[PDB]
Structure 1
Amino acid sequence: MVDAFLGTWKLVDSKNFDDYMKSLGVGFATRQVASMTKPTTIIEKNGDILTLKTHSTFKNTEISFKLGVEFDETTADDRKVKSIVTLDGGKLVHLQKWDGQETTLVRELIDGKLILTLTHGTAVCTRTYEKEA
């Protein structure tokens, strides 16, 4: 049910990422570089296991998980969180919990583009990714 998300995607638009990073306590110098970075995200499956790679000239991450099963994660900004990824309304919903805080990373396909919505506190960031062949 995750198959249309699979593949290699590149960032082509970003709105409010600085607000999102600042809400998470990311320092100004990291926000500055991040605001000019265009990651490539690779989403692959093997059976029930998804692997999500985020690559860039700055930070790089990789997670593997089963939908609906909690996993430990250490984020690009070094938060140690408890995570779960599920499908909800056709959207891939990633919830991170740490210190009583929460953030969601929600991916949906709209007109063939992958729209990533990042919410923490009041901050709502929308990042648009485009396929790669």
Structure 2
Amino acid sequence: MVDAFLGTWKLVDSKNFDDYMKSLGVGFATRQVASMTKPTTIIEKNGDILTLKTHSTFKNTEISFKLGVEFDETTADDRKVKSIVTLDGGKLVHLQKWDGQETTLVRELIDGKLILTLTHGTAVCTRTYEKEA
């Protein structure tokens, strides 16, 4: 069910990421650096466990989870959140909750590209990733 998401992916387009980061309270200097960063995202499975790595010079993250089972997460911007990742409509939907707030990270495949839609508050960011061979 998750298999077309698996592999190594490179950021090739970003829309409204500054809006999204600002909504989360990320400071201006961090937003500068992030606006010029192109992460690599690696999604792997081993049985029922998925591991999602996000790699960049000034920040790396890694999470492991089972679909549909809540996990604790500490995000790149140091929020301590309660997370769950599920498939919905063929999309990989990651929901983070903290302090009564929520954000969603939705991944879908369109024409072989991985489209990541990030929503917090009213801010909606769309990041496009291309698969590495």
The TM-score, its normalising length taken from structure 2, stands at 1.00
**Structure 2: tracts of 5 or more residues without a match:** none
Residue identity over aligned pairs, in percent, reads 100
Q: How far is the alpha carbon of 1:58 from its aligned partner?
A: 1.8
Q: Which runs of 4+ in 1 moved over 4 A?
A: none
Q: How far is the alpha carbon of 1:13 from its aligned partner?
A: 0.1
Which SS does the other structure have where 1:33 is aligned?
helix
Q: Which residue of 1 aligns with 2:52?
A: 52
Q: CA RMSD in A?
A: 0.3
The TM-score, its normalising length taken from structure 1, stands at 1.00
Q: Deviations over 1:16-65 (max 9, x none)?
A: 00000000000000000000000000000000000000001121000000
CA distance in 1, matches of 2:64, 2:108: 19
Q: Which residue of 2 aligns with 1:98?
A: 98
CA distance in 1, matches of 2:32, 2:72: 28
Q: Deviations over 1:60-108 (max 9, x none)?
A: 0000000000000000000000000000000000000000000000000
Aligned residues: 133
Which SS does the other structure have where 2:127 is aligned?
strand
CA distance in 1, matches of 2:23, 2:59: 19
1:89 aligns with 2:89: yes
Which SS does the other structure have where 2:77 is aligned?
coil
Which SS does the other structure have where 2:36 is aligned?
coil
